[PDB]
Design a protein around this ligand. Structure first.
Ligand code: NAD
Ligand code: NAD
Lengths: 450, 447
């Protein structure tokens, strides 16, 4: 029976049609998983040398076509040119990192561990990995999952978010040229496509997205290996001797990708002495950041309405709204301005919810110990920053914060070598660094009687 | 509070009446472990390792009581229980040492103008839920790395075998500090209440059905699963002379109640009959009640009966049953060799969890590998043969976390164990186990 599900995608900067795309249903998901399964034996049988070379060519091909990736990434996100260009560079770098890391791995030392036996330990891939990724960093979130998965010798079915299939489709095209047909397969679709993929004949699921989706996936993934990266609600603890550029730096991080980052600063926590300085300093810095000029739109109409709802429900006694300046002809885009909210209770909706927009709340604590309690007082625990001059104060807080990343006098700065990953309700995945490879491979002990 | 009335599996007679924990007791146990978490996590690695070394030595100092306790609800022979007490202490010493010797991604100037480093941090309170087949060792496998990583632990032993878990909690209190390890006896609903409690992670060892339930019940808690095996032993025609004796020894260890016990013997056509007869001769010398212990409980014995009755095996060799006088009411089942059976036979596809071996023939090593890898479960395997290229090529191809060559069921604290497929994806033993119980933190400092 002839049947095609269709999405008419729109540019978030303008609201106009940009792309009509067919969505994958059960037949396309089943076929994609079978294609990756069929490519698995030849891909896994490559030596590390040959596998690394393929991934290096993959990264160079992305780089060679970087202008095309930049346009594709911006079409569905509204990202500024400079942010998209940086993320294409970071994508290729991450692939190069794992290309090199897959040859440099270690295992428990081999030898005579049992009397009269020679033993060693080898690492082996899981098989087919499903990677399901959101719209906020389509290319980078794809790279975080497929990089280590492919490098560990798995094949991959990649399911991008409904509004941002574009770079995932280019990745599949360029992987076919450099890794081989079927090694990386992309299936565009909405949430239902993702659910079908989780129930398919894949060996593992690598998910990045909302907590509600994460909780649904846990149940329906069964005994498949599961890696979750969920929301953050990240604190920034600002001490009275914080450096002069603290407010500019925090506002720069909060308006990067229009504040649509898991690890963006959200909950600014000061002491009593610097509370009003921080509110005014953040308000002045944010006011210089104009939506439509200095950062992009929110991804879609649901995000903009959600922003509106949380702002309306907040009991903030102080509210500073930055300018809204959509370019000519872009009034139909999902533009929302920067906001600073202050004078609000510890359980305020703007504090407790992940706003996912350039909104900063400001709370005051009596002393560093209460600031730490506020910072660690949320169920999510992903990233954090500390701002201050005194080594003992900031490094002690850095050890105490419940987060996979703690920045001191900076925020939202990442590199392929250093891990990222949550606690609490943020999921327990590890992205970046050599530590990410372990999620996609399993050890085998071989013990030989002499 | 409900009271469980436990019986001795060697006799069927009452042996212990012990409280079965419900929600109030589970909730209080988790709060006790949570209250101990801050001081335990604050110990330096030097002090934490010294605590765990004293824990291991206290267990060995009290090994006679651990042996009696372990045997009481299992029926294990004395020599097997004594060896498992030694392995328990050794594993604790291994993780005492490993916790000081860890590494992390190298620190330094990874970003311009930034100094970065990576530290490891505990999850918090870990729930350890373990089965009755190796009560002490499976407790050790979970609590060892969890405690060494700075977590406190709530340990939920199987209903029929709380005995050594209670001793561990007493001896942990004396060496690690009160509340660092808390033991909660109970049944599967005690375990479900623990999964739903305010623990940060669940480390589970047991049946596939329970694992599937726990996945849905555990929510966003970090989860580690060690589930069933159905382990093949590929026996080539040039396998060494002691092959059948060694396979039978591994299959009757702990009355075959091992996740990694050999189950599916797979030969070629030229050595098929030799294997059936050699295994039957070796198994016939192992008499249930003298040379190995009972099955754990009446459910296990009935499960044995159902699988054997359902099998379409054309060949069946039954070893003798010889329970001592006074032990006629225990859950005794004999060793068995089954052969001449289809590839989807119940005895082949199910984990019998008793001293039963099936024997199947393949045309060549390629088809032997297909059979060995043709099950949903994928935990451990062995290969028996003399030629280096043949056995080592098979060892690479088998889907298993452990492959033994010309041996079976031999483990040590340094070397990992862990499943694929429907066997779960946890890692036990080796330094690799520690990662399940800790999380990295990148600290990046602006210069
Ligand atoms: N922890 C991290 O590293 C990280 C990184 C980026 C984003 N995030 C989080 O992701 C969230 C973004 O929200 P969103 O609305 O884009 O997330 P979402 O969960 O709605 O969508 C994410 C992806 O999952 C798919 N999906 C949704 N429900 C599914 C289901 N039941 N089964 C299978 N697939 C399903 C979607 O189609 C999409 O591809 C934020 O909470 C953010 O913090 C976390
Ligand atoms: N390393 C491994 O992979 C490994 C090691 C030993 C045993 N095993 C497997 O363990 C199995 C033993 O079977 P069994 O019947 O004793 O196991 P089981 O799953 O019935 O019980 C195991 C433990 O889990 C508890 N439990 C049961 N259901 C639960 C639930 N829904 N939620 C929480 N806790 C629950 C029980 O009370 C007990 O403490 C075998 O299949 C064997 O292969 C695996």
């Amino acid at each position: 029976m002839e049947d095609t599900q269709v999405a008419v995608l729109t540019d978030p900067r303008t609201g106009r049609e940009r792309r009509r795309i067919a969505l994958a249903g059960e037949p396309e998901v089943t076929a994609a998983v079978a294609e990756a399964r069929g490519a698995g034996s030849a891909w896994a049988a490559l030596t590390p040398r040959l596998r690394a070379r393929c991934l290096l060519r993959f990264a160079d091909l992305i780089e060679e076509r970087s202008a095309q990736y930049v346009v594709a990434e911006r079409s569905g996100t509204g990202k500024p040119a400079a942010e998209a260009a940086g993320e294409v560079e970071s994508c290729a770098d991450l692939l190069r990192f794992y290309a090199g890391a897959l040859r440099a791995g270690t295992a428990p030392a081999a030898g005579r561990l049992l009397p009269g036996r020679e033993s060693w330990v080898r690492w082996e891939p899981l098989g087919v990995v499903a990677a399901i990724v959101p719209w906020n960093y389509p290319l980078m979130m794809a790279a975080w999952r497929i990089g280590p998965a492919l490098a560990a010798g798995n094949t991959v079915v990649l399911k991008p978010a409904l509004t941002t299939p574009d770079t995932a489709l280019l990745l599949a095209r360029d992987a076919a040229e450099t890794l081989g047909p079927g090694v990386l397969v992309t299936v565009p679709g909405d949430r239902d496509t993702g659910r079908l993929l989780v129930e398919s004949a894949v060996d593992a699921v690598a998910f990045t997205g909302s907590e509600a989706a994460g909780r649904d996936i846990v149940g329906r993934a069964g005994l498949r290996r599961l890696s979750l990266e969920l929301g953050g609600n990240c604190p920034a603890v600002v001490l009275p001797d914080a450096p002069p550029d603290t407010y500019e730096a925090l506002v720069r991080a909060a308006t990067y990708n229009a504040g649509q980052s898991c690890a963006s600063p959200s909950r600014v926590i000061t002491l009593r002495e610097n509370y009003q300085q921080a509110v005014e300093g953040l308000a002045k810095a944010m006011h210089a950041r104009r939506a439509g000029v200095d950062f992009g739109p929110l991804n879609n109409a649901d995000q903009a309405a959600r922003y509106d709802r949380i702002v309306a429900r907040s009991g903030a006694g102080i509210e500073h709204v930055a300018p809204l300046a959509p370019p000519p002809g872009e009034e139909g885009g999902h533009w929302r301005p920067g906001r600073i909210l202050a004078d609000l209770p510890a359980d305020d909706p703007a504090v407790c919810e992940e706003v996912f927009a350039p909104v900063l709340t400001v709370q005051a604590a009596d002393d560093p110990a209460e600031a730490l309690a506020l910072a660690n007082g949320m169920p999510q625990a992903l990233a954090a920053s500390v701002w201050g001059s005194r080594t003992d104060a900031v490094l002690e807080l850095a050890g105490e914060l419940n987060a996979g990343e703690v920045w001191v006098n900076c925020h939202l700065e990442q590199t392929a070598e250093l891990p990222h990953g949550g606690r609490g309700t943020s999921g327990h995945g590890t992205d970046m660094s050599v530590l990410a490879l372990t999620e996609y491979q399993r050890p085998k002990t071989v013990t030989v009687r002499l």
